[PDB]
Structures are given as C-alpha cells and as structure tokens.
Write a protein that holds these residues in place. Structure first.
Motif, PDB file in Angstrom:
ATOM      1  N   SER A 167       0.742  -0.953   0.015  1.00 52.73           N
ATOM      2  CA  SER A 167       0.042  -0.220   0.038  1.00 52.73           C
ATOM      3  C   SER A 167       0.900   1.377   0.084  1.00 52.73           C
ATOM      4  CB  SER A 167      -0.811   0.102   1.245  1.00 52.73           C
ATOM      5  OG  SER A 167      -0.264  -0.151   2.510  1.00 52.73           O
ATOM      6  N   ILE A 168       0.198   2.415  -0.134  1.00 50.70           N
ATOM      7  CA  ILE A 168       1.006   3.764  -0.130  1.00 50.70           C
ATOM      8  C   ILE A 168       0.551   4.591   1.125  1.00 50.70           C
ATOM      9  CG2 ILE A 168       1.011   5.954  -1.173  1.00 50.70           C
ATOM     10  CD1 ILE A 168       0.087   4.341  -3.938  1.00 50.70           C
ATOM     11  N   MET A 169       1.746   5.009   1.599  1.00 49.47           N
ATOM     12  CA  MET A 169       1.329   5.751   3.009  1.00 49.47           C
ATOM     13  C   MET A 169       1.858   7.246   2.414  1.00 49.47           C
ATOM     14  SD  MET A 169       3.228   5.977   6.864  1.00 49.47           S
ATOM     15  CE  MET A 169       2.706   4.356   7.292  1.00 49.47           C
ATOM     16  N   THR A 192       7.509  13.994 -10.019  1.00 50.85           N
ATOM     17  CA  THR A 192       9.058  13.830  -9.284  1.00 50.85           C
ATOM     18  C   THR A 192       9.229  14.882  -8.137  1.00 50.85           C
ATOM     19  N   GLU A 193       8.213  15.583  -7.697  1.00 53.51           N
ATOM     20  CA  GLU A 193       8.115  16.368  -6.594  1.00 53.51           C
ATOM     21  C   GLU A 193       8.303  15.578  -5.367  1.00 53.51           C
ATOM     22  N   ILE A 194       7.509  14.281  -5.418  1.00 52.32           N
ATOM     23  CA  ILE A 194       7.458  13.691  -4.261  1.00 52.32           C
ATOM     24  C   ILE A 194       8.071  12.175  -4.424  1.00 52.32           C
ATOM     25  CG2 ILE A 194       5.529  12.344  -2.765  1.00 52.32           C
ATOM     26  CD1 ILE A 194       3.683  14.166  -3.963  1.00 52.32           C
ATOM     27  N   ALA A 195       9.106  12.077  -3.497  1.00 54.38           N
ATOM     28  CA  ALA A 195      10.228  10.812  -3.431  1.00 54.38           C
ATOM     29  C   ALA A 195       9.178   9.594  -2.596  1.00 54.38           C
ATOM     30  CB  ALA A 195      11.287  11.382  -2.717  1.00 54.38           C
ATOM     31  N   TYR A 196       9.566   8.478  -3.055  1.00 56.99           N
ATOM     32  CA  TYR A 196       8.994   7.372  -2.476  1.00 56.99           C
ATOM     33  C   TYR A 196      10.107   6.134  -2.348  1.00 56.99           C
ATOM     34  CZ  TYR A 196       8.003   6.842  -7.501  1.00 56.99           C
ATOM     35  OH  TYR A 196       8.092   6.845  -8.812  1.00 56.99           O
ATOM     36  N   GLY A 197       9.666   5.413  -1.544  1.00 57.51           N
ATOM     37  CA  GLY A 197      10.325   4.229  -1.402  1.00 57.51           C
ATOM     38  C   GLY A 197      10.143   2.902  -0.763  1.00 57.51           C
ATOM     39  N   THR A 198      10.835   1.981   0.028  1.00 56.74           N
ATOM     40  CA  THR A 198      10.399   1.019   0.520  1.00 56.74           C
ATOM     41  C   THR A 198      11.432   0.553   1.583  1.00 56.74           C
ATOM     42  OG1 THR A 198      11.442  -0.860  -0.920  1.00 56.74           O
ATOM     43  CG2 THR A 198       9.300   0.108  -1.769  1.00 56.74           C
ATOM     44  N   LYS A 238       8.411  13.701   8.679  1.00 54.72           N
ATOM     45  CA  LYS A 238       9.041  14.878   8.818  1.00 54.72           C
ATOM     46  C   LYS A 238       9.656  15.683   7.286  1.00 54.72           C
ATOM     47  N   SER A 239       8.668  14.891   6.454  1.00 58.88           N
ATOM     48  CA  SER A 239       8.885  15.314   4.839  1.00 58.88           C
ATOM     49  C   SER A 239       8.205  16.606   4.030  1.00 58.88           C
ATOM     50  CB  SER A 239       9.110  14.281   4.069  1.00 58.88           C
ATOM     51  OG  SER A 239      10.231  13.463   4.296  1.00 58.88           O
ATOM     52  N   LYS A 240       7.139  16.940   5.253  1.00 57.97           N
ATOM     53  CA  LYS A 240       6.556  18.221   4.731  1.00 57.97           C
ATOM     54  C   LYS A 240       5.504  17.457   3.601  1.00 57.97           C
ATOM     55  CE  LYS A 240       9.909  21.659   5.560  1.00 57.97           C
ATOM     56  NZ  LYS A 240      10.631  22.730   4.938  1.00 57.97           N
ATOM     57  N   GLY A 241       5.240  16.332   3.547  1.00 59.69           N
ATOM     58  CA  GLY A 241       4.591  15.648   2.324  1.00 59.69           C
ATOM     59  C   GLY A 241       5.509  15.313   1.066  1.00 59.69           C
ATOM     60  N   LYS A 242       6.695  15.739   1.023  1.00 61.94           N
ATOM     61  CA  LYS A 242       7.517  15.504  -0.099  1.00 61.94           C
ATOM     62  C   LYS A 242       8.003  14.007  -0.153  1.00 61.94           C
ATOM     63  CE  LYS A 242       6.913  19.624  -1.359  1.00 61.94           C
ATOM     64  NZ  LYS A 242       5.988  19.710  -2.497  1.00 61.94           N
ATOM     65  N   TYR A 243       7.692  13.136   0.691  1.00 64.11           N
ATOM     66  CA  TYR A 243       7.978  11.644   0.843  1.00 64.11           C
ATOM     67  C   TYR A 243       6.724  10.708   0.908  1.00 64.11           C
ATOM     68  CZ  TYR A 243      10.571   7.253   1.648  1.00 64.11           C
ATOM     69  OH  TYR A 243      10.909   5.994   1.559  1.00 64.11           O
ATOM     70  N   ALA A 244       6.675   9.880   0.026  1.00 64.66           N
ATOM     71  CA  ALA A 244       5.660   8.755   0.358  1.00 64.66           C
ATOM     72  C   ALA A 244       6.315   7.479   0.615  1.00 64.66           C
ATOM     73  CB  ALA A 244       4.763   8.534  -0.936  1.00 64.66           C
ATOM     74  N   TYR A 245       5.831   6.548   1.342  1.00 68.17           N
ATOM     75  CA  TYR A 245       6.305   5.319   1.664  1.00 68.17           C
ATOM     76  C   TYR A 245       5.469   4.140   1.290  1.00 68.17           C
ATOM     77  CZ  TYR A 245       8.786   1.750   4.666  1.00 68.17           C
ATOM     78  OH  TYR A 245       9.431   0.615   5.042  1.00 68.17           O
ATOM     79  N   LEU A 246       6.227   3.240   0.593  1.00 68.71           N
ATOM     80  CA  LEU A 246       5.460   2.048   0.278  1.00 68.71           C
ATOM     81  C   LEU A 246       5.568   0.769   1.076  1.00 68.71           C
ATOM     82  CD1 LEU A 246       6.650   2.478  -3.503  1.00 68.71           C
ATOM     83  CD2 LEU A 246       4.135   2.305  -2.848  1.00 68.71           C
ATOM     84  N   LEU A 247       4.698   0.470   1.844  1.00 71.19           N
ATOM     85  CA  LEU A 247       4.531  -0.636   2.956  1.00 71.19           C
ATOM     86  C   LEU A 247       3.372  -1.385   2.741  1.00 71.19           C
ATOM     87  CD1 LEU A 247       4.044   1.045   6.331  1.00 71.19           C
ATOM     88  CD2 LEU A 247       3.084   1.688   4.122  1.00 71.19           C
ATOM     89  N   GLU A 248       3.445  -2.575   3.648  1.00 73.29           N
ATOM     90  CA  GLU A 248       2.136  -3.568   3.570  1.00 73.29           C
ATOM     91  C   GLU A 248       1.004  -3.016   4.157  1.00 73.29           C
ATOM     92  OE1 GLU A 248       4.729  -6.813   5.209  1.00 73.29           O
ATOM     93  OE2 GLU A 248       4.838  -7.777   3.236  1.00 73.29           O
ATOM     94  N   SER A 249      -0.123  -3.261   3.659  1.00 78.69           N
ATOM     95  CA  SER A 249      -1.335  -2.348   4.194  1.00 78.69           C
ATOM     96  C   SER A 249      -1.655  -2.890   5.735  1.00 78.69           C
ATOM     97  CB  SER A 249      -2.552  -3.179   3.275  1.00 78.69           C
ATOM     98  OG  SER A 249      -2.572  -4.793   3.435  1.00 78.69           O
ATOM     99  N   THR A 250      -1.206  -3.771   6.101  1.00 78.01           N
ATOM    100  CA  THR A 250      -1.380  -4.000   7.606  1.00 78.01           C
ATOM    101  C   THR A 250      -0.896  -2.956   8.419  1.00 78.01           C
ATOM    102  OG1 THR A 250       0.375  -5.578   7.597  1.00 78.01           O
ATOM    103  CG2 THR A 250      -1.742  -6.725   7.654  1.00 78.01           C
ATOM    104  N   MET A 251       0.528  -2.783   8.212  1.00 78.14           N
ATOM    105  CA  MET A 251       1.561  -1.711   8.774  1.00 78.14           C
ATOM    106  C   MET A 251       0.768  -0.150   8.547  1.00 78.14           C
ATOM    107  SD  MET A 251       3.774  -1.554  11.428  1.00 78.14           S
ATOM    108  CE  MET A 251       4.917  -3.224  11.134  1.00 78.14           C
TER     109      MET A 251
END
Ligand SMILES: [Zn+2]
Ligand SMILES: [Zn+2]
Ligand SMILES: [Zn+2]
Lengths: 258, 258
Positions: free
Chosen positions: B109-111, B128-134, B180-193
């Motif tokens: 999922s996307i956080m 590309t304004e918003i960074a994301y990782g896992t 702490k990224s002011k919304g400039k970072y999105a995190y990809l993780l499992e839905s449960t978490m």
C-alpha cells in the motif's frame, strides 16, 4: 500420464461454452479456473483432462459412513489427480488432502435483493421477517455450524431448524431465491461469488456489510502426491507475476454487465 | 527440547513491554505475534523461547555469496526452529523454507503524510516532486524490482537510482521520514502496517488507494521440520475459531489513538 483434473460448474470459474456441443475435451469449457488450469499445467509440464465432479459438490465428510463426497472425495479415493476450483482451504479438508498456498483471498458475505433493510450479520440475527441460508455441503455451512461467536451461533440456531429449508444445492439456486423473494430472503455466500453476481444482469442484488471471516481457495492434490510441490510453487509464481489479478479482472469486471 | 522462535521487533507484532526492564524471557514482549506464539505453543504442546533476529531483517539472499540473512537465514542455517512474525510468503523463500497457510492477508500500500496530492501508484509515477521508497531486504522491494507492470516498473527505475536513497532499514524509519518530509516523501509498505500507523498519533498519515497486490504472512519452519505439519494445522484451526480476527482487533483498533 494425463492428469485428471476435477472441477465444478460454478460461474465464472468453470462454464460450458455456448457451442460446447461442437467442441471436444478441454475446449468445451471456459472460465477463471479453466484459464488457471492451462497455466498451472504449462508451468508444471503436464497434460491434463478437465472433468466435472459427478455429484456436483465441493466436499464434506458424512458422519457415520465416514465417506467424503464432492471434489475432495474424488481426490481422497483416487478418482482425480488434482482439483482446480473455488475450493476453500479448511482444517478438516487439509487433514485428508493437500492444498497449495491460496490463489484467491475471500470471506463469507451477505447478498441481498436491492432495497432489503439489512446491512450486517447482526441485523439478520436480530430479526425474523427476512429468512437467510447458505449453500449446502460446503465450508460456508460448516462455518456457522461450528461457530462459537454469539451472532453466528444465533444465526445457525435459526437456519438449522428453519422450515422449509433455507439451504440450497447450488449458488445459482441461492441467487435465484434472493431475486424472486421480494426481499424476504438473504443469501450467505463467499465474497468472490457475491461480487461477481452484483455485476450480472438484471443487477438487482448487492453485497452488504464486511466479510464475516477471512480464508482462501487453494489447488488441491491427494496427500503424498507427486504434483503437490510443483503446483504450489506455480501458484506463488503466477500470483507474483500478476496473472491471478489479471484473471479476476477478466472474468469479473471486464465482462461486467451493470 | 525448548523451541527457539525467531521474530522481529515490529509494532504491533512484537514490542518490548513498558516495564520490560524488570521482566525476563518471553515476558519482556507483547504484541500480535507474541499472542500467536503462545496460542500455537499451547495447541502443539511445546515450550518456547522468543528471540529477536540478530540483524533485524526479514530475509533476503545475497546475490554474490548466495547467503540468506534475517529470520529466513536463521531457519535455513539452523539457528532457529520457527519464525513467528509478519514474514511474507514468497516464491524464493518457499524454495528454501516451509510456510504454513497464511495467518494474515495483505498487500502493498501507499502511505502519505496527509494533504499530500497523491491517490494512487500511478500518481506517484507521474511526478517527481514527491519521493517514495520501500523497506530493505524484504518482499516489497523485491516486488518492484521484478515487476513487469508499466507503472511499477517506472517506479522502480526511479527508486533504484534515486539520490539520496529512498530505501529504509526499518518500517519505523520510513514512517518517520514521511512525517518529517512536509509531504515530499511517500512510503510503500504492507497494508497491515499502514492501517496500524494511520490509527496512531500524531495521526498525520493515511493509506491511499487500493493495495498493489495480494499476499499473506505465514509461520515459517526449516524444510524437514517435525513442527511444520502441526503448526500449519494449528494456524488453520486458530483462524477458524476467530482468534486471528480477535487478535487484529485487539492490537490494531482497540489500542487506536486517533
Ligand atoms: Zn504462464
Ligand atoms: Zn486456543
Ligand atoms: Zn554481498
């Protein structure tokens, strides 16, 4: 040798093609499981023959005679080499046959005729004007029979003693009963089937509330089967590649009629 | 012999109690997996010791040495007898260890912070304004690395060469990075978490969009383990009793602070 596959006529998993009389062998059928069977066979490297289970049941043991019926029975007694169908992975079955990791996740759900004043299992349990039942000889009926949860136990107490019977022989019979009940009959079936029917004309039914439980469908083989390991890995590979999601979209929504 | 259980500190699965300093052995921990371990040990009738995986990882194989790390490694090399944690059932892992049927169903999922202009994976791959990782050394990163879907492939090309690194060592670091990224970072993780964190104060994150895939967590044992069979049946029995759903309610929403 050619692998004997047992399956069940349950739309949209396995269905007769409009012109099946003109076709032969596996070509006579189409559907989600028909598509899945072809892929599993290719990845495992075996030829196969699709056969429809004789008694048209999924599988349950008869207390007293102790004989397993349905697709489970065909595997237990050696009449089929593998079962590819919407067969629920359960403890009692896992005790007599092997299951691959699930190829589909689902749960028990409620199907109502649009407009019916029901929004949950608790709603059904607290009233009596609206009757409700499940498929017979399956995991859904067993869920309620064995449930120790207040709401579900109350539901089972009612259903087991209801007259006439609130249970049905096939999904199609249950759906038809809801549609012709004028809102006086709600059907308890697995979410996947509920979602499928909600997209079928005349678009007069709907899934309400959250699922009552969580479980999955798995490919089944006789205990100690030579195909077990390979089939399991095949299911995992196919899910990770997205085939499983592709197939559900194909048979559920791509062909939606509502 | 006491069964050695390998696990990982990951809320709400396994966490040190508030007063852990005055406690010993298994009593130092609490959480979903701590409760599950107790349930399993009771039905299979065995004594156990909870141990936190040394390197703090779930389990990936070193492409050069071919050596497995994390909980998977502890099972493969015989450092532990069973792993009870949010360990994803995957093809590469299933090839070296055994997994019980899933005890929890989930998906990637996307956080996002909150107020972040993102509603889907596609949206992330459009700008590309918003960074994301896992997370690292896990099933999620491997998902993007191997994906053939245009969107997931476009996302991985970015994450693989992103500067600085958009990957984290623990879920905690990923969540902290979103906040702490002011919304400039999105995190990809499992839905449960994701769902767990969304119910935790400062209540500034949220899950957006549907899951990218469907998978499950399973209890792992080394191949040829005398516990494999029994544990698998134990998991099925527990799910059917409603214990697993009871436990998720307990650790996910009952303790919710939003
Ligand atoms: Zn293929
Ligand atoms: Zn118990
Ligand atoms: Zn290396």
């Amino acid at each position: 040798k050619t692998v004997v596959v047992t399956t069940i006529l349950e739309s949209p998993y396995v269905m007769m093609k409009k012109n099946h009389e003109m076709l032969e062998g596996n070509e006579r059928y189409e559907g989600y499981c028909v598509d899945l069977a072809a892929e599993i066979a290719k990845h495992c490297g075996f030829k196969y023959k699709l056969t429809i289970v004789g008694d048209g049941k999924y599988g349950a043991r008869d207390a007293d005679t102790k004989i397993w019926n349905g697709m489970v029975g065909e595997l237990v007694y050696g009449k089929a080499d593998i079962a590819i169908a919407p067969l629920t992975i359960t403890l009692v079955r896992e005790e007599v046959i092997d299951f691959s990791k699930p190829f589909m996740s689902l749960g028990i759900s409620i199907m109502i005729k649009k407009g019916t004043p029901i929004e949950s299992a608790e709603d059904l349990s607290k009233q009596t004007e609206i009757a409700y039942g499940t498929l017979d000889s399956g995991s859904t009926k067993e869920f309620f029979r064995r449930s120790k949860i207040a709401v579900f136990d109350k539901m089972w107490t009612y259903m087991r003693s209801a007259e006439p019977s609130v249970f049905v022989r096939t999904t199609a019979e249950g759906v038809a009963r809801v549609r012709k009940s004028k809102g006086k009959y709600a059907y308890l079936l697995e979410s996947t089937m509920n979602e499928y029917i909600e997209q079928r004309k005349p678009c007069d039914t709907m899934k309400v509330g959250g699922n009552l439980d969580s479980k999955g469908y798995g490919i089944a083989t006789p205990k100690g089967s030579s195909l077990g390991n390979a089939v399991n890995l095949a299911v995992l590979k196919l899910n990770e590649q997205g085939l499983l999601d592709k197939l559900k979209n194909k048979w559920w929504y791509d062909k939606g009629e509502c």
